[PDB]
Design a protein around this nucleic acid. Structure first.
Lengths: 150, 129, 143
RNA sequence: GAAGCUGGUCAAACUUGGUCAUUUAGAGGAAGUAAAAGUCGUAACAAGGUUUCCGUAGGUGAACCUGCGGAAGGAUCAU
RNA sequence: AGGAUAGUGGCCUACCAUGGUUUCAACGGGUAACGGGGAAUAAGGGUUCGAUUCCGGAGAGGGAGCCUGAGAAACGGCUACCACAUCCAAGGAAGGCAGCAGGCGCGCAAAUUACCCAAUCCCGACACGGGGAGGUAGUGACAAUAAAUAACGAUACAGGUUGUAAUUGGAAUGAGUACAAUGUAAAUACCUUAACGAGGAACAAUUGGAGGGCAAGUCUGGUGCCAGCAGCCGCGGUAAUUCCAGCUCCAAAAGCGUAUAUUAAAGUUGUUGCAGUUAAAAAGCUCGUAGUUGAACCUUGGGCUUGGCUGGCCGGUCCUGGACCCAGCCGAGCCUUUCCUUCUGGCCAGGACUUUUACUUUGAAAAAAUUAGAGUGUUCAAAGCAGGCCUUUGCUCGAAUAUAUUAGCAUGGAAUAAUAGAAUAGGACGUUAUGGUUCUAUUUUGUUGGUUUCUAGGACCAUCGUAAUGAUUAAUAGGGACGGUCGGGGGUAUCAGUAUUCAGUUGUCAGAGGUGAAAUUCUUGGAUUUACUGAAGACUAACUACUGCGAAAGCAUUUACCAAGGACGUUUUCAUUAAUCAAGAACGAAAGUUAGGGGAUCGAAGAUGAUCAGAUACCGUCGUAGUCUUAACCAUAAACUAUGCCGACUAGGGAUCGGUUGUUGUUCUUUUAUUGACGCAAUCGGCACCUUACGAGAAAUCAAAGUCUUUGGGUUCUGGGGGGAGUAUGGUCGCAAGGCUGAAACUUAAAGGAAUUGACGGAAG
RNA sequence: GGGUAAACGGCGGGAGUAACUAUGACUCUCUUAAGGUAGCCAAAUGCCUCGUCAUCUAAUUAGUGACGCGCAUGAAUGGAU
């Protein structure tokens, strides 16, 4: 627990045992799919798309309604990000703390956090190369990383 | 991290049996656990155990009877040849007349007495007495 | 659990670990370093012939108060001078200066014995005759 | 068709140098251990008569003292 | 590509590329290193040894080069040099025992310059010769086997039908001595054997001891801390259970001590199987690589038929054998939606295909010797593989079988652990799907050889038709996203606050300061004290806690910003992305180092006044570095929870922090809600605390220090009696101070941990 | 009257004393503003002096390494490297 910390918290989501769409749910399989795509074009990440689905539109699980995962729908509609969402956000946070460091050199805590973040990037990046999501020559460089998160 | 569900199962069984409890919850369940209990159940060492489905790894509720002395795993799963069994029985089991060596074999999970009958050998998997 | 590797592919880590920790054992360390072959006066031998240089009486360690009568012997095999005990009531008289004495250990295997300070060897034969046979006067010294 | 001869080849051996390893000498210096407890003091063990100990830096015949920051293995589990 | 070789090959040459090995330990060094079969010790796992009766290799003083020859880089073949070395008539000539015996040296350490080809086998022109190969003898307490120094009576006292203790006998026999025969190539020896061969049957048994360990004296005499003994503890200072003597007794016995090394003992090297809070020992802390280890999940169940061996029932009994019967334990063969390659000749033989394994059964192998072990009366035995038969003009059990164990081969199986497939479909089937693209060819029409279309096999390409067309859960493992939070988490500016010191003013007036007491010191040139004004640097009191945050070190005035973070909430998202980790990185209290800036206060050094025998110490007064900060180093602390990190379970209880979920005779917002605080139930996570001991521990104690002789969740590090010593040396990092790595000689029987009693305290009651 | 030594400069004598001797950690003693500290030395600084020991050579008043009561070494009159 807490790969890069000492915490042991367990706060998380608990999907229901029921894998079938609720009785009160009136939307069809496809209507969700284009509804997903409509928010996809607004730049909303799959985490954001799922969040806005349940909050305002009543989609508890997109897999129990559409049959396929939110990101899997995006890939078959050509909307899957080149940089995966979790990797994307790790790199963007890495840039922001880095930028914080050229104005605050004495923030040793910021330097230590930056090492942890880039440590997390490379482990997640090594995964995406064993599974052919990223090119086998993919490398994270701090100098020009802002190009990928631009 | 959680490296062996079989070890976490027999331990919670022993930590319940010494405590005198007549039931114990096992989490998570697996085929290796379920087939392990059956070898224990056909010898009366435990009672009617239930499998809970939670669309997940699974859970097991075991019923305890009080005839179990000590059940434990042998980790790592050493490779045991037919001439390797007599050494494993002597060191692990209190007496030559009772107690079992659970071996996983190409023929299935079995104790050393059923293993010697059909003269097959595999990897040692635990013990019970 | 138990702090040492148990995985099935970890036979190497155990092989190196044990061999490293055998060096803390002095029996193993003395054998491999060959300290007997280098620094031990016999050079790892059981007995040795040497030449007596001078006879010495030594004050004892506490609480015993006595004199242990040993001699200065130079060894013929490697030219070292080390002290050897003469053990028998009145066997100092049997040994003379510049005699060839066959020495042995005290059974402490390189360690000082009893209250005797700085001495580890004892005379077994003088002029080719056992000092026990001379103390019992079974034979007589050749001279 | 012998000795012999030319050029090659393998190359013993020596000289020089370098290197590595193992032994061994040395004025003097600075330690350690043993002995008996010779000289000076009393540092520690009691609140050991200045609580002790750690790291670090100065100082001092010597044990040691002092500063700064720790620890309680404190003489306090407590207002 | 060539040369050379018997031949492959950088083996060598020419040309051309820049490769090859390595933390899975290359390369280098040491080796008191020839390797193996084996030996010692061993409950097991293991440890030490292996020159040496067998196999393979290398060498003949150290190199080098060749002749002959199938076969040699040969040495009881040569040549040359080096080092020794023999004769010499001084010109020259001849050497090689790490073969046999034998001589010197070295050592703690090791045999006769004997005989012979008779046995085994080898060599030759070979029934005939040769063989220090080989065999026999000499020395030989290397080891091992068997095994003598007595036995039985009668008296005799003691004695409970007999065990003897003394003085009284007649037998038996080999140790030895020898005819002779056997034995042998000839002898010695063994065995057989006439005669000789025992009363102290002198035909004489020794080696160590007798305090404990450890078996066997408190017997006598000698010495008198001396001699000496004593592996260790100790014994000896005039009654020594321990030295020096005698007597007695013990242990083993033709054998018994000493020394050294090693094995067991040693669970003190720990895979089985150690320890790490305090006895030695958890890296200061995080990241992280190799390595080690890694959630669950994919044909189960049912039904039928059948083969085999256990118990009986059968009994069928000379323990023993049969269907039916009962079960049991396996093997199968089918149906269940059905894996189990596929065709030809027709369960074998001829074809075409196959995810890789790891693992395990069996087979083959793993030389002989050695080990275990079958049989066999070498008189037994160690042995040896002989042998046994009514006595044989021959008959006849044998001369096994196991263990080997890693690598390689074959084989049955499919749990356990991996590995692969169908996501922009480049997917699987159409066996005879349609075509099209090409390639191969046996067979023709036989009088023989040319023509390219049917045809058959690939190997593909496009189209159409098939299918239930094709993606496991989201782990109370993880990562990320989002929502309100919560923090004395961090950085940069800014805002207080008093206090301290120093100054300027105002007021008096003899002291002030400081101590246990004083003195140094400041004071009528106004000290101390008073009020106000002013400046500097530090530090953020009280609130402040068995409270918070942080990887640790640490973090406490306000506000603004900056970028982070944990926990909770989540019917969001990705799906194993993880745990611990050699090597390598970031941070790392104080002190210390370098350069600027600041330097109020404290204050190492130093100076000082006391105290004292002396104190250059503690006490007092000053005080320099420093304390603060900006740039960089250092990388250590009792960096401590003296307790590695991750995971699971185990016993009750109440408080408290952050979140979140349902709720009040409560006050307030505001007069009420959708305020806030408080109060009551919950759960998450924490920091902890109380009791108990199921259990653990040497105990103190411990909710982990439990789930550990009923010994196994993963993994990293560390320790092996105390010193010497974290020293020396080498390396490496640092400006230095120093850090990291890190011995040995030598020395010692103890060092130490927890607790008990007492004693003591310039401690409390 | 106070301050100031990277101002000029300065930086002491005598006795006894440790189960041989030798030496003197130590003590006593007079005295200074302070009594030479860290270092270094027969040094380009030491008279005695060609000091003593070692090394270098057959032989060395030379050289180097040590020793140190040093006529008369010594810390920005800079000390040691």
């Amino acid at each position: 627990g807490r790969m890069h910390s000492s915490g042991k918290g367990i706060s998380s989501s608990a999907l229901p045992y029921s894998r079938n769409a609720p009785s009160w749910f009136k939307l069809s399989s496809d209507d969700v799919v284009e509804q997903i795509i409509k928010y996809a074009r607004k730049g909303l990440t799959p985490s954001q798309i799922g969040v806005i689905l349940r909050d305002a539109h009543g989609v508890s699980q997109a897999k129990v309604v559409t049959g396929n995962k939110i990101l899997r729908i995006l890939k078959s509609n050509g909307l899957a990000p080149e940089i995966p969402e979790d990797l994307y956000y790790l790199i963007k946070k890495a840039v922001s703390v880095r930028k914080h460091l050229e104005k605050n050199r004495k923030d040793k805590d910021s330097k230590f956090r930056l090492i942890l973040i880039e440590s997390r990037i490379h482990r997640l990046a090594r995964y995406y190369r064993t599974v052919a999501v990223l090119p086998p020559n993919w490398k994270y460089e701090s100098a020009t990383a802002s190009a990928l998160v631009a | 991290t959680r490296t062996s569900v079989l070890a976490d199962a027999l331990n919670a069984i022993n930590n319940a049996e010494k405590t005198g409890k007549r039931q114990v919850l096992i989490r998570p369940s697996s085929k290796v656990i379920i087939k392990f209990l059956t070898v224990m159940q056909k010898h009366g060492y435990i009672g009617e155990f239930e499998y809970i489905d939670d669309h997940r790894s699974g859970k097991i509720v075991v019923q305890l009877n009080g005839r179990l002395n000590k059940c434990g795993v042998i980790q790592p799963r050493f490779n045991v040849k037919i001439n390797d069994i007599e050494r494993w029985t002597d060191n692990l089991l209190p007496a030559r007349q009772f107690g079992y060596v659970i071996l996983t074999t190409s023929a299935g999970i079995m104790d050393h007495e059923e293993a010697r009958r059909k003269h097959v050998s595999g990897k040692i998997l635990g013990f019970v007495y | 659990g138990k702090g040492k590797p148990r995985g099935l592919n970890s036979a190497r880590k155990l092989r190196v670990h044990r061999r490293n920790n055998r060096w803390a054992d002095q029996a193993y360390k003395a054998r491999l370093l060959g300290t007997a072959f280098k620094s031990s006066p016999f050079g790892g031998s059981s007995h040795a012939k040497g030449i007596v240089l001078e006879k010495i009486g030594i004050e004892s360690k506490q609480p015993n108060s006595a004199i242990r009568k040993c001699v200065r012997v130079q060894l013929i095999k490697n030219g070292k001078k080390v002290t050897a005990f003469v053990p028998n009531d009145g066997c100092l008289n049997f040994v003379d200066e510049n005699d060839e004495v066959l020495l042995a250990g005290f059974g402490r295997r390189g360690k000082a014995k009893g209250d005797i300070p700085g001495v580890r060897f004892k005379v077994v034969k003088v002029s080719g005759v056992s000092l026990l046979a001379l103390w019992k006067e079974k034979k007589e010294k050749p001279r």
